[PDB]
Amino acid sequence: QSYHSSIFFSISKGSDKIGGLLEYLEIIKKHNINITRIESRPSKTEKKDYDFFLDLEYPTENNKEVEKVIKDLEEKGVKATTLQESSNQTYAPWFPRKISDLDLFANKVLEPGASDPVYRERRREIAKIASTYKHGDEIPRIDYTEEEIKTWGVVYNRLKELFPTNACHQHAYIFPLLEQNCGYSPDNIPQLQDISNFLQECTGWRIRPVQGLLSARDFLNGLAFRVFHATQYIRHPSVPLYTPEPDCCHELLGHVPLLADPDFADFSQEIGLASIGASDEDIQLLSTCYWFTVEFGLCKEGDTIRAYGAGILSSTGEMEHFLTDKAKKLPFNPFDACNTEYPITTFQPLYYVAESFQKAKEQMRQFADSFKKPFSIRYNPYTQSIEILD
Amino acid sequence: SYHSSIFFSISKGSDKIGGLLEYLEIIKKHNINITRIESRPSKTEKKDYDFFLDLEYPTENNKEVEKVIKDLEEKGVKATTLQESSNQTYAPWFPRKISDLDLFANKGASDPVYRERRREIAKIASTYKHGDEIPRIDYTEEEIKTWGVVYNRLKELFPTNACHQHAYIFPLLEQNCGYSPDNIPQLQDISNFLQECTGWRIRPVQGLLSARDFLNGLAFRVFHATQYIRHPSVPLYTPEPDCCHELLGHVPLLADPDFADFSQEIGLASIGASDEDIQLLSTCYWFTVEFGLCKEGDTIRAYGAGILSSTGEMEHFLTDKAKKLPFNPFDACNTEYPITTFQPLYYVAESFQKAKEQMRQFADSFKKPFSIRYNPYTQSIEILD
Ligand SMILES: O=S(=O)(O)CCN1CCN(CCS(=O)(=O)O)CC1
Ligand SMILES: O=S(=O)(O)CCN1CCN(CCS(=O)(=O)O)CC1
Ligand SMILES: C[C@H](O)[C@H](O)C1=Nc2c(nc(N)[nH]c2=O)NC1
Ligand SMILES: C[C@H](O)[C@H](O)C1=Nc2c(nc(N)[nH]c2=O)NC1
Ligand SMILES: CCCC[C@H](N)C(=O)O
Ligand SMILES: CCCC[C@H](N)C(=O)O
Ligand SMILES: [Fe+3]
Ligand SMILES: [Fe+3]
C-alpha cells in the first residue's frame, strides 16, 4: 500500500521565474525518491498559462515531505495546490488524472463463501491476469472450461426468457447486437476484449479486467473515464439464480448491455465524475446511489415497471421479485436514496424507479453540486483526462 | 487492393432481420473478399440497427460487389455502397474508424548511402499498426548533426517570425518531449504529448500518401509523419517533408486547441468527398497548415509548417516581393503554387476558429451521400442522412 499525492500550480509564459523553477524541478526529479512524475501542459483555463503536475508516492499516510516540497515551490514564486490520498482532511482527496492512471488501482483489491478447492488455481490464474494488465493492452482471453461454460448456459438461458417481459427496452434493443457482434450465446462465454471494442464504438465505454473488488472510490473514479472494471471468473456451478460475488455473468449480462445505451452511458459517467475528489462520506452516498440505480434500478415504461439494474438483470430470482408487490417502489431522488439502507445478501425489499437516464444524469449532477468541493471538474473526451476548474 | 463498403439500416422488430442474419453469416463464411460485417445501434433513428459490410478486391470496380448488393436487397433492405474508384459509379469510400487507417500502409540526395538509409527508416512505417508503440529510430551522428544545424538556425528566427502559438508551445516540447539541438525527438514521445493536449496522435508514414488518404487521416486527429531527415547539404530549404519539418513545423501548432480543431475540420471535409473536392481541400491545406500566415496587430507572422521548418522560407515571407492576401477559402482553393521553390503568395488568417468556420462553410456545399460527423467519445466517424 502506497499513498498518492499530487501537486498543482500554474505560471505564465514569460515569467522570469520559469528558468529557476525548471532547475528546482530537475533537482527534485533526481533526488526525491517519492517523485514519480513531473509534467507540464498548456493550461486549460487561461490561454497564456502553463500548468504543472507533480505526482508523488509515499509509503505512509500523511508524510511531512509533501510540506517540504510545497514550501520549496512557494519560494520559487509559485502557488501550489496539493491533493492527497488520506483518511485525514488536511488536503482534498487525490484522484487519477488521465485514463492510464487507472493502472494505479491494479494492485488494490479489497474482497467466503463457496469453498471448492478446485476453482482456486483458476481464480489465481484469472486474477493474476488482471494485476498484470495495464492500459493499452489487449485484455487477455480466457479458455473457459466445459463446467464454466455450462454454468453460463444455465444462467443465460434462464435469463434471456424473462428479458422481454421484465427488462427495460434498452436492454432488449442492445442484446441482439451482443449476439451478432460479441458472440453472446448460451454455448460460449464472451471475451472482454471483444466486448470492450463493441462498447468503445457505441458509447466510448471500455473494460478493464479487475482482480476483484476495488474500493468504492477507485471503482467510481474509473467510471469518470467511462471505464468499467469487470471480473472474468464465473459463479460456482450451483448458484445460478442468485450469487453474492460479481461473476462475469453479472458483468456481461447485467452491466454490459446498458453501457451501449448513450443516455445510460452518460448517466454512469456522471456518477464517476461526481466521485472525483469527493469526500469519503460523499463516496459512500454515491455508492448507495450506484446501488439503487446501476445495480438495482427500475424504469417505468408507460404503466409498466421494468428492470435496468445489473443486479436484477443477472439474477432470474430478482427478476421474479421486483415484479411482485413483495417489494415497494419509490421515485429515484439522490437526496433521498442516500440515507437509505439496503440488504446485500437478500432480494431488495425496496426499489427506486428512474424516470429516464437523462433526468437521472441531471439529478446526479445536482447531487454532485451539493458536495463540498475545492474545485469543479470536467471531462475531456479528446485528451481522455480530467480537467480541474476553480 | 480496392476497398468497398455497404451501408444499410433496419428497424428493431423487422420481419426480415431473421433471414438477413442468416445470409450475412453465410456470405461471411463463403466470400473471401468480405473483410468484415458489423452492426451498431443507430445514431439517427432510436429503434433501428445500422449494418456495415466491408469488401476488398484486387481489381477496380469489381462486379462482385454489385451482386452482393442485389442479393442483399432481395432480402429486403436498401443499400448504399461506397468505393475506392476512379469512377463515380459509387460515392468515394472512406475509413470509418481510426484503426482503418492501417489500410493506408499499403501505398536532393544522389548518395547511394542516403538512399540505403531511407530504405531502412522506411521499412518500419510500413510495419506499424494502430495500437503499437511507434518504434524509435537510432539516429546517426550525421543525422543528429543535420538536426542541430537546422534546429539552432531556426531557433533564432522563431521569436520574431513565428506566430505566438508556436512561441507558447515550444518550451513545453523542450520540457516534456526532449526537444534540443542535441537529439532528435521520437514520434512516440511526441504522440503522447499531443494526445494529452488536444487529442492529436502521430502515425509514422513510409513516404507520401495520396491527398485523400492523408486528409482522411486528419478527420481522426491523426497526423502522418516521416522519420527520416533531409540530406546534410539541404538544411535551409528542401522541397520534401522530413522529420525536422514534421517536428519543428507541424507538431507545435497541433498542440493548440483551436488549430487542432481547424486541422480536424479539413479532414472531416475530406471524408467521402469527391476527387475534385479533395483537390480543393488539398490546396486550402497548403495555404494554411503548410504555408499560412497570421495577423498579430501591426505585424504578420508565420504559422505554416512549411515556413517554420525552413529558415529560407522564413526569411522570405516578411519581404515585399511576396504578396499577402486575407485568407478566404474560395480565393485560395483555386490558387496554383510551386512545390520546389519559395511561395510567391501567402494567405493571412485572422484566427484558427474563424478559419475553421470558413472551412466548414466552404465544405457545406460538398456533395456527399451521407452527413459526416466525428464522435470524440467513440473516436470514429458517425454517418447521418
Ligand atoms: O455515448 S455517445 O458517444 O453516443 C454520446 C455521449 N455524449 C456524452 C456527453 N453528453 C453531453 C455532455 S454535457 O452537456 O452534459 O456536459 C453528450 C453525449
Ligand atoms: O483541442 S481540445 O481537445 O483541447 C478541445 C477541442 N474541442 C473540439 C470540439 N470543439 C467544438 C466546437 S465546433 O468545432 O463544433 O464549432 C470544441 C473544442
Ligand atoms: C460501486 C460501489 O462503491 C460498490 O460498493 C462497489 N462495487 C463494485 C466494486 N468493485 C467491482 N469490481 N465491481 C463492483 O460492482 N467495488 C465497489
Ligand atoms: C495534405 C495534402 O494533400 C498534401 O499534398 C499532402 N501532404 C503530405 C502527404 N504525405 C505525407 N506523408 N506528408 C504530407 O505532408 N501527402 C499529401
Ligand atoms: C453486486 C451485484 C449483485 C449481483 C446479483 N445479486 C446476482 O444475483 O447476480
Ligand atoms: C511541404 C514541406 C516543405 C518543406 C520545407 N520547405 C522545409 O524546407 O522544411
Ligand atoms: Fe454490478
Ligand atoms: Fe507538412
Task: Confirm if A204 and A114 have CB atoms less than 8 A apart.
Answer: no
Answer whether B290 contacts ligand 6 (Cβ < 6 A): yes
CA-based nearest residue to B199, from A42, A194, A267: A42
Q: Give the burial string for B63-83 (b: 16+ CB within 10 Å, else e).
A: eebeebbeebeeeebeebbbb
State which residues form the domain around B205: 1-385
Tell me which DSSP letter residue A324 carries: S
Q: Is A173 on the interface with B (CB under 8 A)?
A: yes
Would the annotation count A255 as a binding residue? yes
Answer whether B208 contacts ligand 4 (Cβ < 6 A): yes
- Give the mutation candidate from B377, B382, B383 for the A interface (greatest A CB count, under 10 A): B377
Residues of A catalogued as catalytic: 250, 255, 295, 314
The answer to whether the CB atoms of A202 and B378 lie below 8 A apart is: yes
Give how many domains chain A has, as a whole number.
1
CA-based nearest residue to B352, from B229, B231, B255: B255
Q: Radius of gyration (Cα) for chain A, nearest Å?
A: 23
**What values do phi and psi take at A7, rounded to 5?**
-115, 135
How far off is chain B from A384, nearest CA to CA, in Å? Answer: 7
User: Which listed ligand is nearest to B380 at the C-alpha?
Assistant: 1
Tell me how far the alpha carbon of residue B196 lies from the centroid of ligand 2, in angstroms: 14
Task: Confirm if B354 and B328 have CB atoms less than 8 A apart.
Answer: no
Residue with cell 485484455: A139
Residue with CA nearest ligand 3 atom 15: A246
| Cα B136 to Cα A137: distance, rounded to the nearest angstrom | 19
Q: Is A379 on the interface with B (CB under 8 A)?
A: no
The answer to whether the CB atoms of A202 and B380 lie below 8 A apart is: no
Answer whether B199 contacts ligand 2 (Cβ < 6 A): yes
Bond before A113 cis per omega within 30 degrees: yes
The answer to whether the CB atoms of A203 and B12 lie below 8 A apart is: no
Q: Which CATH number covers residue B7? A: 1.10.800.10
Euclidean distance between the first and the last CA atom of chain A, given in angstroms as a whole number: 31
Tell me how far the alpha carbon of residue B266 lies from the centroid of ligand 2, in angstroms: 14
The number of C-alpha atoms within 13 Å of B181 and in the hemisphere containing its C-beta is 11
* CB-based contacts of B224-229 (< 8 A; 24+ apart in sequence): B224/B104, B225/B187, B225/B190, B225/B250, B226/B125, B227/B121, B227/B124, B227/B125, B227/B137, B227/B187, B228/B117, B228/B118, B228/B121, B228/B122, B229/B139, B229/B143, B229/B146, B229/B147, B229/B184
- Residue in A138, A173, A200 closest to B12 by CB: A173
**What values do phi and psi take at A240, rounded to 5?**
-65, -30
Residue with cell 456451478: A237
Task: Confirm if B279 and B340 have CB atoms less than 8 A apart.
Answer: no
Q: Is A204 on the interface with B (CB under 8 A)?
A: yes
* Residues paired with residue A49 on neighbouring β-strands, in sequence order: A12
| Cα A352 to Cα A331: distance, rounded to the nearest angstrom | 5
| Cα B282 to Cα B278: distance, rounded to the nearest angstrom | 6
CA-based nearest residue to A6, from A55, A43, A51: A55
Residue with cell 457505441: A202
CB < 8 Å to B375, chain A: 204
Quick one: resolution in A? 2.4
Task: Confirm if B72 and B79 have CB atoms less than 8 A apart.
Answer: yes
Supply the angle between the helices A216-223 and A280-290 in degrees, to the nearest 10: 70
Return the ligand 2 atom nearest residue A44 CA: 4
| Cα A141 to Cα A129: distance, rounded to the nearest angstrom | 10
Task: Confirm if A215 and A85 have CB atoms less than 8 A apart.
Answer: no
The answer to whether the CB atoms of A174 and B49 lie below 8 A apart is: no
The answer to whether the CB atoms of A42 and B168 lie below 8 A apart is: yes
| Cα B372 to Cα B364: distance, rounded to the nearest angstrom | 11
CB < 8 Å to B167, chain A: 13
Q: C-alpha grid cell for residue A339?
A: 440515507
User: Which listed ligand is nearest to A291 at the C-alpha?
Assistant: 3
| Cα B181 to Cα B158: distance, rounded to the nearest angstrom | 14
CB < 8 Å to B97, chain A: 201
* Residues paired with residue B345 on neighbouring β-strands, in sequence order: B323
Distance of CA B157 to the CA centre of its chain: 28
CA-based nearest residue to A151, from A243, A31, A52, A289: A243
- In sequence order, the 6+-apart residues with CB closer than 8 A to the CB of A302 are none
Q: C-alpha grid cell for residue B91?
A: 460515392
Would the annotation count A250 as a binding residue? yes
Return the ligand 6 atom nearest residue B241 CA: 2
How far off is chain B from A178, nearest CA to CA, in Å? Answer: 9
| Count of residues making up chain B | 385
Tell me how far the alpha carbon of residue B261 lies from the centroid of ligand 2, in angstroms: 6
Task: Confirm if B82 and B94 have CB atoms less than 8 A apart.
Answer: yes
- In sequence order, the 6+-apart residues with CB closer than 8 A to the CB of A118 are none
Tell me the residue ranges of DSSP E strands in chain B. Answer: 2-11, 34-41, 48-57, 80-83, 91-92, 201-204, 222-225, 293-296, 299-302, 323-326, 345-349, 371-375, 380-384
Report helix, strand or coil for A111: coil
Exposed (0-12), middle (13-18) or buried (19+): which is A159, by Cβ within 10 Å? Answer: buried
Task: Confirm if B246 and B224 have CB atoms less than 8 A apart.
Answer: no
Task: Confirm if A126 and A232 have CB atoms less than 8 A apart.
Answer: yes
Residues of B catalogued as catalytic: 245, 250, 290, 309
Q: Is B196 on the interface with A (CB under 8 A)?
A: yes
β-pair type (A3-12, A49-58): antiparallel
Q: At B175, which amino acid appears? A: Q
